[PDB]
Amino acid sequence: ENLYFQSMPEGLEELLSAPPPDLGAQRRHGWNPKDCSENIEVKEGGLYFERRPVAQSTDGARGKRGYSRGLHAWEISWPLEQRGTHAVVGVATALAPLQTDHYAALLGSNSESWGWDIGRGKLYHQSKGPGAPQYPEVPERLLVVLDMEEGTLGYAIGGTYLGPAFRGLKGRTLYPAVSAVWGQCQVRIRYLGE
């Protein structure tokens, strides 16, 4: 607990205690209808997306805003029963592919994306699965914490930061992202600042 807490990005406690960004801000930093799989429909102007039922496909979405500096955190809400075989949460550059023709951990399967498999607890970056390391059951809601001053991506569950999952991100422009496989899944994004 001391180890994880001592690793926290600067300013995270005050970001999380601040009056949360309003709906307009959540929509401006939400899912981009112009930057998602053809099998995904962005709803509520960015607050959530719904993946249509399509067999043998993995489908992702990016947020509207890419981050290159500062601290950025957003809550992902993803119902436990709508995760299926591969539910991956993280970030991507604008170059990562958002669709593939099979069920896979698409986010993090290349050098343009970084993801946490919230079902298996594994981290993916340039990984097809074998050798992916374990990282700290994920409930419906989780916090995604992108520190672009240090260049790390980490997560929090139930108010506890679990440490950096990925490092060496400085010099890139990174967007919130997920890859999903479940028909009719509804994945919410709630930008919290900065």
Partner: peptide, 4 residues
């Protein structure tokens, strides 16, 4: 599978 996967509700598809």
């Amino acid at each position: 599978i996967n509700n598809n």
